[PDB]
RNA sequence: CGCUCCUCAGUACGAGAGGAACCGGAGCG
């Protein structure tokens, strides 16, 4: 399918802060997903890496927190994180990047970091259940959205 | 001792969405 994501970027061909539309492939954010590593981010970039997604290691959801309205169970199922992440029974959303053209992440170059952008893709542990195309409202930081579709 | 860079380490430690330090290396005061 294709996510469309809204965030204010300021188009360095420009300056100004820019209200751009984004559109993301489903498919390719997958695609993107798969030729992830399964690991939380012991990675040079850090990705991917847990989205708690307002949730505790336990299952609990933190104060003045909720959840993103991603709709599949599993995605809404309070997630159960233990320390390394690996957790012979753990069960966990993770993140990664996604950008429209689709390219995979360069997961491992810190120094220097590749640009992560302001969309992530959402998929299950250890399943990589894909969840939803999620990103942040202003820049390549804040607070995560669910964009549509 | 102070500051820049590497490294430590995307580690430790976090979950307001991130993120140190000590040791060590290069340099300036
Ligand atoms: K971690
Ligand atoms: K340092
Ligand atoms: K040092």
């Given at each position: 399918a294709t996510w469309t994501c809204?965030?204010?970027?300021?188009?360095?061909?420009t300056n100004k802060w820019e209200?751009?539309?984004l559109l993301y492939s489903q498919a390719k954010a997958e695609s993107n997903s798969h030729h992830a590593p399964l690991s939380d981010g012991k990675t040079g970039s850090?990705?991917?890496?847990?989205?708690?997604?307002?949730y505790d290691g336990n299952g609990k959801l933190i104060k003045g927190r909720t959840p993103i309205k991603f709709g599949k169970a599993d995605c809404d199922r309070p997630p159960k994180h233990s320390q390394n992440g690996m957790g012979k029974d753990?069960?966990?959303?993770?993140?990664?990047?996604?950008?429209?053209?689709?390219?995979?992440?360069?997961?491992?170059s810190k120094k220097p970091k590749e640009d992560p952008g302001p969309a992530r893709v959402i998929y299950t542990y250890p399943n990589k259940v894909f969840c939803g195309i999620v990103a942040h409202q202003r820049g390549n930081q804040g607070d995560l959205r669910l964009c549509s579709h």
């Open positions: 809204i965030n204010q970027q300021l188009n360095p061909k209200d751009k539309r850090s990705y991917p890496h847990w989205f708690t997604n307002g753990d069960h966990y959303l993770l993140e990664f990047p996604t950008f429209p053209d689709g390219h995979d992440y360069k997961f491992d």
